Structures are given as structure tokens and as C-alpha cells.
Design a binder for this molecule. Structure first.
Ligand SMILES: [Cl-]
Ligand SMILES: [Mg+2]
Ligand SMILES: [Mg+2]
Ligand SMILES: [Mg+2]
Ligand SMILES: [Mg+2]
Ligand code: NA
Ligand code: NA
Length: 460
């Protein structure tokens, strides 16, 4: 093989070997650990908040000499070279040699560092602001640093989890939940509340993903590569959510179904679907739509897939089938734009649906509203479900037509006593030699309980 790198002679204040869950409820998860999630291990220095880094970098004359703390997932060899040469890219060339630029990207996102370092190495550095920039990064919360820039290495953690394979009833109930899902029974997700996570884990399934947002006029962004451990694609990220921002489209595995970012979650904070379940979270874009297209023949036996839209409080979720492909689109806005979702949001959803289905956008009326979405879906897809919020006060939100191939679920109406929220989810399961596809939309009221539902099957 290749000689193991020996870190003992290096200048590393904090160096240790990370233990996976299986070596410490998740006693069978041998390729992940709680090092960074949900709480960053107390041995590790914490990164500088993204907003503070942006503040320093935006006032460079005032803070060029000050430092920030950043994280990175790297290989064994990269981590050793960073710690040995004390430069951002593990280079021993002098910075001056560039002026007679190669860059490495670090992150302020704990979840991003978790994703990148799992099964590899975590490196934490302190670096002066004059060496960082984010002008050309593709991933959220990333900062490029010249490979030759000096850094102070604060921690290196070996997260390769090289350990002999493992030979309140949370584990047992979660295994039953997996068996229920894996049978193709949508009832496992009924009534147990909303779920979402900001975690990023690559799942087995590749799918087309698209984004249309008013921040980027004149373009629909299309991603056909896997959602992988490099980080959070900035097109599927919303810097305005909370403090460090949040992803608007991410995949994770079912050992965590909801985390503390899921507004209103209950049952799925406690129990899970095991890490054999693959979950795709599709949220709205800041001012527009995110969508995915799944090839039903690529769902694999004993690897069920769950799509969740998170907590619905005004946004529109579309599930649809055309041929051998399933579509999920979530449109709306995070900027409290009254009337956007039932008008511009519909237009953005149609842009995404047309892009994913490889159709030219059809001719649309001058006034685009939720009825327009019903018509578009009816004419261009085999079957569809719209889950949406309507009020007699906002006429554009009201759906007053019907099409035989389009179901609609108003998870909010004026008849609802707040507080309330909606959910909309789909399961895709290869069982009995076919791909079962079942969708479920719910309204929750009041401890929140479901009082209104629509269940739609998209399989034969
Ligand atoms: Cl991953
Ligand atoms: Mg990283
Ligand atoms: Mg490695
Ligand atoms: Mg129950
Ligand atoms: Mg949510
Ligand atoms: Na183990
Ligand atoms: Na050294």
C-alpha cells in the first residue's frame, strides 16, 4: 500500500483519532461520529461565524491583520502537509514565488466540515483575513486561501474510522419504522409531524436538480452530478436563513430524520428510519423554485428514498410523474413577499419543471397564478399533486379549476385556526419488483396533530 503518515513529530495542539458511533442508539453506525453534530466536540476550537468573516473581509483595511478560525475536510496526506509546512495548501513554496495562484478552500460551516471530513481528516486552522476570499467559491460558507499562505494549525482529527467491523427502544422502533417504509407503506410517515435536516450525506441515488431564483435572472441552474461531500452548492443554499444560512436542497441518511433546524418537528427528533434510508430535502429558493427529477428505475431494493419539503407555511410543493420519472418542486420565497408565491413562484416552478422535463417553456398567460400551475401540470405531466396555501383574501392563491390528472391540497385555508403548518412528502420504494411511489400531504393544528390529509399514489 502507501506508507501511513506519522503525525507525532508535527506541531499540532489537538490531534486524535475519532471514534464512530459503533465504538462509543446508533451502535451499528461505524462510518460516522458525533464529533461535529449536533454539538462540536469540546476538544475542538470553534470556527468564526460566517457573518463575522464576511464582516472582516468586507472591511479589509480595518481587519486585514486579524484572524479567523476555519475548518476543512482533507485526505491524510493533505492534512499532514498542512500541519508540516504550516501553509493553507500544504505547500512549501514561498508566497513570493507566485510573483516571479493555487488555492485551497476552507469553510466556516460545521455541517460542511462534518460532511467533508467524515471517513477522512478534519483540519482546523487560524488564518489572517488578508489571505482569504470567497469571490469564486462554488460552495456555501467557503473561503479560498492561497496554497502558500501561512496558517496556524489548531487541530487535526483522523476520522477514517479504522475499527474492526461491528458483529427507550429508539433503535428497535426505528428498525420497525424502516421495515414499514421498506414495505412501501406510507403510513409510517402519517401524523408524526414534519421532518427536515441540514445534514449533508451523499446518497446512492443520482438525480437531476434545478434552481430558478430572482437573484439570478435569465437562467435555470441545473445540477446533474451527485450531491456529495465537497460542500453545499451555493445555488441550493440561502444565506439569509438564520445566521450562517441554510441549504435549500440537500440529501442525508435516515439515522437522523429531523434535527433542531426543523421547525415544529416532534416524533422525528426522537426516532429515525436508520441509515439505510435516503432522504432528499427540497425547500423553496430564496425567491423561486428548487426541483428534482428521479428515474424510477434507479430506486434500489432495500434502499428506500424519502422526499421531504419541511415545514410549509405559505410555499407550494408539487409532486408529479411523467413516464418513468418522478418530479418534486418546491417554490416560494424566504423574503416575506406578499403575493409572490402564487404568481412569480408559479413562474419559477414552471421554469424548473420545463427545464427538468427537457421542454421549452410553453406560452403562458399575462397573469400567472395557481390556476396556471394546475393547467401547466395537467397538460405536460401524467399526474400531479399541488400542496399550497390559499386565502380568499389573496385571489391569486385560490384554485377554482380542476383537472382530472391534478390533485390539489390547500394545507392552509382561512378556515384554519393558527398556529398551523403543512407537510408534503413522498416515498419511493423498490419492492415486489416495482417502484412504489406514494405522496402524502398533511395539515397540522393546535402539541400539533394532523386533521386534514391528501394521499396520492403515483405508481401502477
Ligand atoms: Cl457523504
Ligand atoms: Mg471542507
Ligand atoms: Mg484520508
Ligand atoms: Mg406513532
Ligand atoms: Mg423546513
Ligand atoms: Na465499530
Ligand atoms: Na513539521
Amino acid at each position: 500500500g502507501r506508507q501511513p503518515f506519522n503525525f507525532e513529530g508535527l506541531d499540532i495542539p489537538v490531534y486524535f483519532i475519532d471514534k464512530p458511533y459503533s465504538e462509543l442508539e446508533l451502535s451499528f453506525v461505524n462510518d460516522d461520529s458525533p464529533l461535529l453534530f449536533p454539538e462540536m466536540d469540546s476538544r475542538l476550537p470553534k470556527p468564526t461565524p460566517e457573518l463575522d468573516i464576511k464582516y472582516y473581509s468586507s472591511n479589509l483595511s480595518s481587519f486585514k491583520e486579524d484572524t479567523v478560525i476555519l475548518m476543512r475536510g482533507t485526505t491524510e496526506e493533505e492534512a499532514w502537509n498542512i500541519a508540516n509546512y504550516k501553509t493553507a495548501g500544504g505547500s512549501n513554496k514561498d508566497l513570493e514565488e507566485n510573483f516571479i495562484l493555487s488555492f485551497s478552500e476552507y469553510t466556516s460551516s460545521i455541517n460542511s466540515a462534518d460532511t467533508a471530513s467524515r471517513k477522512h481528516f478534519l483540519v482546523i486552522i487560524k488564518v489572517q483575513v488578508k489571505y482569504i476570499s470567497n469571490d469564486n467559491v462554488l460552495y456555501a460558507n467557503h473561503w479560498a486561501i492561497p496554497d502558500e499562505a501561512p496558517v496556524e494549525v489548531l487541530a487535526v482529527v483522523d476520522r477514517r474510522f479504522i475499527f474492526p467491523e461491528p458483529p427507550e427502544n429508539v433503535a428497535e422502533i426505528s428498525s420497525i419504522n424502516f421495515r414499514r417504509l421498506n414495505s412501501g407503506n406510507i403510513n409510517v410517515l402519517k401524523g408524526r409531524g414534519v421532518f427536515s435536516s441540514r445534514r449533508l450525506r451523499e446518497i446512492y441515488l443520482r438525480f437531476d436538480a434545478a434552481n430558478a431564483d430572482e437573484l439570478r435572472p435569465g437562467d435555470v441552474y441545473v445540477k446533474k452530478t451527485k450531491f456529495d461531500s465537497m460542500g453545499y452548492d451555493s445555488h441550493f443554499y440561502n444565506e439569509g436563513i438564520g445566521i450562517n444560512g441554510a441549504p435549500t436542497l440537500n440529501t442525508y441518511t435516515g439515522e437522523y430524520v429531523a434535527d433542531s433546524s426543523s421547525q415544529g418537528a416532534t416524533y422525528w427528533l426522537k426516532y429515525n428510519l436508520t441509515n439505510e434510508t435516503s432522504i432528499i430535502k427540497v425547500s423553496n429558493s430564496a425567491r423561486g423554485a428548487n426541483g428534482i427529477k428521479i428515474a424510477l428505475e434507479e430506486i434500489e431494493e432495500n434502499k428506500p428514498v424519502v422526499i421531504t419539503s419541511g415545514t410549509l407555511t405559505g410555499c407550494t410543493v408539487v409532486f408529479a410523474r411523467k413516464g418513468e420519472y418522478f418530479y418534486a418542486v418546491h417554490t416560494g420565497n424566504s423574503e416575506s413577499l406578499i403575493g409572490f408565491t402564487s404568481t412569480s413562484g408559479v413562474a419559477k416552478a414552471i421554469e424548473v419543471l420545463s427545464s427538468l422535463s427537457e421542454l421549452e417553456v410553453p406560452a403562458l398567460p399575462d397573469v400567472i397564478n395557481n390556476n396556471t400551475l394546475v393547467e401547466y401540470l395537467s397538460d405536460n405531466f401524467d399526474s400531479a399533486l399541488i400542496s399550497y396555501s390559499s386565502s380568499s383574501l389573496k385571489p391569486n392563491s385560490m384554485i377554482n379549476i380542476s383537472r382530472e390528472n391534478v390533485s390539489t391540497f390547500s394545507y392552509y385555508t382561512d378556515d384554519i385556526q393558527l398556529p398551523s403548518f403543512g407537510t408534503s412528502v413522498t416515498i419511493l420504494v423498490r419492492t415486489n419488483d416495482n417502484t412504489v411511489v406514494r405522496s402524502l400531504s398533511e395539515s397540522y393544528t393546535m402539541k400539533m396533530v394532523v386533521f386534514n390529509v391528501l394521499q396520492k399514489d403515483f405508481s401502477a
